C-alpha cells in the first residue's frame, strides 16, 4: 500500500529489461506486481548405498525425496499452502488470546531482559562465509539500518526457493507441505540484530518458559515427555495443526508483536521496522512456468500474514502455540465455553486472567512445545472435546473431522514429538535410558541422499550419518550394524562433514573423530541429568537395544533372510568401499 513501494521499484529497475505485466497469474490472496524471465533451477551417497543393499528393494528408501526447488513445485506449494488465508477469530476469542498472550510475555520477561545483538555475535554463529569477511558488505547493512530507522525497507525481500514435503503414511506423522524461504544474508543480520535475543538468550528454554524445550537436545526430549507423563491427569494429547504456518491469524501476529512493548529506544525502532515492514508487509519472489518450457519469476505481496522463513520463525511459533494450548486448557477446565466465542463477558474475562495468574505456571509445565509440535497432558480427558476456541483461532487439527474428539495416548512411549517417539529401555547393568526412535526406512533413505557432487565429501557425510546413529539410534539393530560398518569403511582420520538433520534439536555431538563410545557415555551418562548412577559403560556390547518385536514394527529387517545374508557378508561390503576410496587408515569396528 505504502511501505512496499521502495522494494517494488528497486525490483522493476534491476530487471526492467524482460519485465512484463500480468500473465494470467493464479494469485488470489497475494497482490500481483509483475514478473521477469530467469534461469530455472529445476544425488546418491554411494557409501551408504553400498552398505545398505537389502534396503535397495524397499520402496520407502529408494523412492525417497522431499526436496522440490523446481519452478513447477514452487507454484504447487505456493498455491495450496501459501496462497491461503486463515480467517480472523471472533471478537470474544481475540480478547481471550489477549489475556493469555499478555500473561506469557510477562512470564518470559520475569528474569531475562531483552538486548540488541552484535556484529561479532552474528559472525561467530555462521562458522556466505566469504561475505561476512568483507567489510564492504557491512556498509550495505549500515545503509539499510538507517532506512529502517527512517521507516523504510529497500532490500529485505523474501525468495520462495521450493517445497518441503513429507510422503504421508505409516512411520511418521503426515506433515503437510511447507515453503522454503531464503533471503539475502544482510537481511539475516538485521532482524537478528533486533529480535535475535529470543533465540540467543534461550527465551523459550524450558527453564524460562516452562512448556518449551528450546536448547534441549533430542536425547533430552524423551525424559521431558516422561516427566509430563509422571504428572497426574488424563491421557496425553498431541494434536497437529493442519498447516500451522498457513493458519497464523493477524490476531496472533499482533499478540506476537507485543515484543515491542518490552524494548527501549533505538532497540524498538529497529525491531518495529522488522515486524511491520518485513514481517507484516511481505514481498516475495517466486518462479512460475509459462510459454514454451520457459520460467519467469513473479513478484507479489501480502500484508496480514507472518508465515515462515524468518530468524524467529521457531521462537514465535513456539510462543503462540503455548498460548493456544493454554486457551484450550481453559475451555477444557470450564473457564470458558462456546457461549463466549462471539463476545467475552467481563464476568468470564476475569476468571480467565485469574486462571492464568494462579494456574498458568503449573499448566505450562504439562506441555512440551517445540514450534508447531505440541504435547499436552491436561487434568482430565475433557480436553479431547475442548475444540470450540481451538477451531475458532483457525488452528484446525489435521487428519481429523473438524469436531471429532481428539485422540489421546495412554502410553507416553507412543507419543510423537519432534519427528520421534520415545522408548524407555533397560540397560544390561540394570539402569534404564529413554531413547528417541523413528521410522528406520526414513533414516536410511535420508542417509542415502547426498547434496554434493567428491569421494571424501561423500564418505565424510556417510560417516556423519553413521556416527549420528551410534549416538541416538544405537538401539536399532540394523542402524548400529550399519553405522559401525560405515565407520569401518571410512578412513579413521577423516572428519565428518555436512548435516544429518534439520531438526533444531539436533546438536551434532557426532560430528567428531572422537571415539563415539566416549561421546555416547558423555551424553547418556555423564551429562544426562536423569541418570543417577554415573558409572561409565565399558563397551558397545553393554549398550542396550529395543525389543525385537518393537524394532521390527519400527522398520527393522531382523529375522529376514535378505538382511541375514547382508549381516554375515558385511565385510565384503566394507572391503569394497575401502578399495574404492583408496589406501587410507581403516579400523574394523565390527567387533
Q: By the criterion CB under 5 A, which residues form the site for Zn ion?
A: 153, 156, 437, 554
Dihedrals phi, psi of 452, to nearest 5 degrees: -65, 180
Nearest residue relative to Zn ion (C-beta): 554
460 is in an annotated binding site: no
Distance CA 147, CA 270 (A): 10
Nearer to Zn ion, 28 or 150 (CB): 150
Question: Considering the complex, what minimum distance in angstroms separates the CB of residue 320 from Zn ion?
Answer: 24
The alpha-helical segments, DSSP class H, found in 473-537 are 477-488, 516-521
Helix (H, G, I), strand (E, B) or coil at 34: strand
Nearer to Zn ion, 156 or 471 (CB): 156
In whole angstroms, how large is the CA radius of gyration of the chain? 25
The alpha-helical segments, DSSP class H, found in 411-555 are 440-448, 455-472, 477-488, 516-521, 548-553
Nearer to Zn ion, 103 or 192 (CB): 192
107 is in an annotated binding site: no
Nearer to Zn ion, 403 or 553 (CB): 553
Residue 404 has which C-alpha cell?
471429532
The alpha-helical segments, DSSP class H, found in 279-337 are 313-333
Eight-state DSSP code of residue 163? E
Query: Do the Cβ atoms of 477 and 484 come closer than 8 Å?
Result: no
Question: Considering the complex, what minimum distance in angstroms separates the CB of residue 153 from Zn ion?
Answer: 3
Nearer to Zn ion, 549 or 561 (CB): 549
Question: Considering the complex, what minimum distance in angstroms separates the CB of residue 448 from Zn ion?
Answer: 19
Helix (H, G, I), strand (E, B) or coil at 86: coil
Nearer to Zn ion, 72 or 184 (CB): 184
Nearer to Zn ion, 51 or 277 (CB): 277
Question: Considering the complex, what minimum distance in angstroms separates the CB of residue 365 from Zn ion?
Answer: 26
Dihedrals phi, psi of 144, to nearest 5 degrees: -70, -35
487 is in an annotated binding site: no
Helix (H, G, I), strand (E, B) or coil at 296: strand
Question: Considering the complex, what minimum distance in angstroms separates the CB of residue 9 from Zn ion?
Answer: 14
Between 561-568 and 570-581, two packed helices, what is the crossing angle to 10 degrees? 60
Question: Considering the complex, what minimum distance in angstroms separates the CB of residue 470 from Zn ion?
Answer: 17
Distance CA 528, CA 522 (A): 8
Question: Considering the complex, what minimum distance in angstroms separates the CB of residue 476 from Zn ion?
Answer: 8
Residue 23 has which C-alpha cell?
500473465
**Helices first, then strands: H and E counts in the chain:** 24, 12
The binding site for Zn(2+) consists of 144, 148, 153, 156, 421, 437, 554
The binding site consists of 144, 148, 153, 156, 421, 437, 554
Amino acid at each position: 500500500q505504502e511501505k512496499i513501494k521502495k522494494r517494488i521499484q528497486k525490483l522493476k529497475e534491476e530487471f526492467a529489461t524482460t519485465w512484463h505485466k500480468d500473465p494470467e497469474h493464479p494469485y488470489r490472496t497475494w497482490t500481483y506486481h509483475g514478473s521477469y524471465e530467469v534461469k530455472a533451477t529445476g544425488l546418491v551417497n554411494g557409501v551408504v548405498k553400498l552398505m545398505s543393499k537389502p534396503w535397495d528393494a524397499i520402496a520407502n528408501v529408494t523412492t525417497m525425496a522431499m526436496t522440490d526447488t523446481t519452478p513447477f513445485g514452487q507454484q504447487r506449494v505456493f498455491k495450496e499452502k501459501v496462497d491461503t488465508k486463515a480467517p480472523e477469530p471472533p471478537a470474544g476469542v481475540r480478547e481471550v488470546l489477549n489475556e493469555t498472550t499478555n500473561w506469557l510475555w510477562a512470564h518470559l520477561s520475569r528474569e531475562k531482559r531483552p538486548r540488541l545483538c552484535t556484529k561479532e555475535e552474528f559472525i561467530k554463529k555462521v562458522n556466505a562465509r566469504e561475505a561476512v569477511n568483507d567489510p564492504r558488505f557491512w556498509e550495505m547493512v549500515d545503509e539499510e539500518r538507517e532506512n529502517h530507522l527512517r521507516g523504510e525497507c529497500h532490500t529485505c525481500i523474501y525468495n520462495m526457493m521450493g517445497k518441503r514435503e513429507k510422503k504421508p503414511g505409516e512411520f511418521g506423522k503426515a506433515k503437510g507441505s511447507r515453503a522454503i524461504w531464503f533471503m539475502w544474508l544482510g537481511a539475516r543480520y538485521l532482524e537478528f540484530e533486533a529480535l535475535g535475543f529470543l533465540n540467543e538468550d534461550h527465551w523459550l528454554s524450558r527453564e524460562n518458559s516452562g512448556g518449551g524445550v528450546e536448547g534441549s537436545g533430542v536425547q533430552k526430549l524423551g525424559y521431558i515427555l516422561r516427566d509430563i507423563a509422571g504428572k497426574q491427569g488424563g491421557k496425553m494429547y498431541a494434536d497437529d495443526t493442519a498447516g500451522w504456518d498457513t493458519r497464523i491469524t493477524r490476531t496472533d501476529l499482533e499478540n506476537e508483536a507485543k515484543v515491542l512493548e518490552l524494548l527501549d529506544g533505538e532497540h524498538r525502532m529497529l525491531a518495529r521496522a522488522i515486524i511491520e515492514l518485513t514481517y507484516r508487509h511481505k514481498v516475495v519472489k517466486v518462479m512460475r512456468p509459462a510459454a514454451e518450457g520457459k520460467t519467469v519469476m513473479d513478484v507479489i505481496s501480502r500484508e496480514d500474514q507472518r508465515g515462515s522463513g524468518q530468524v524467529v520463525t521457531y521462537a514465535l511459533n513456539t510462543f503462540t502455540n503455548i498460548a493456544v494450548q493454554l486457551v484450550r486448557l481453559m475451555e477444557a477446565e470450564g473457564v470458558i465455553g462456546p457461549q463466549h466465542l462471539e463476545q467475552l463477558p467481563r464476568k468470564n474475562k476475569i476468571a480467565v486472567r485469574t486462571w492464568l495468574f494462579e494456574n498458568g505456571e503449573e499448566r505450562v509445565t504439562r506441555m512440551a512445545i517445540s514450534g508447531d509440535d505440541c504435547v499436552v497432558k491436561p487434568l482430565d480427558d475433557r480436553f479431547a472435546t475442548a475444540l470450540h476456541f481451538l477451531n475458532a483461532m483457525s488452528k484446525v487439527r489435521k487428519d481429523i473431522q473438524e469436531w471429532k474428539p481428539s485422540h489421546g495416548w495412554h502410553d507416553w512411549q507412543q507419543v510423537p514429538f519432534c519427528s520421534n517417539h520415545f522408548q524407555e529401555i533397560v540397560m544390561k547393568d540394570g539402569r534404564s535410558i529413554v531413547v528417541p526412535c523413528r521410522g528406520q526406512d526414513e533414516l536410511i533413505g535420508r542417509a542415502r541422499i547426498s547434496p554434493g557432487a567428491n569421494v571424501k565429501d561423500t564418505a565424510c557425510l556417510a560417516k556423519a550419518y553413521a556416527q549420528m546413529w551410534l549416538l541416538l539410534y544405537f538401539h536399532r539393530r540394523d542402524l548400529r550394524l550399519m553405522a559401525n560398518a560405515i565407520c569401518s569403511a571410512v578412513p579413521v582420520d577423516w572428519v565428518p562433514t555436512g548435516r544429518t538433520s534439520w531438526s533444531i534439536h539436533s546438536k551434532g555431538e557426532w560430528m567428531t573423530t572422537e571415539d563415539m563410545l566416549q561421546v555416547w557415555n558423555r551424553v547418556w551418562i555423564e551429562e544426562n541429568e536423569w541418570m543417577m548412577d554415573k558409572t561409565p559403560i565399558a563397551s558397545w556390547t553393554d549398550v542396550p537395544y529395543v525389543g525385537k518385536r518393537e524394532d521390527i514394527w519400527c522398520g527393522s529387517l531382523i529375522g529376514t533372510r535378505s538382511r541375514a545374508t547382508w549381516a554375515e557378508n558385511i565385510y565384503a561390503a566394507i572391503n569394497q568401499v575401502r578399495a574404492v576410496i583408496g589406501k587410507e587408515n581403516y579400523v574394523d569396528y565390527m567387533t
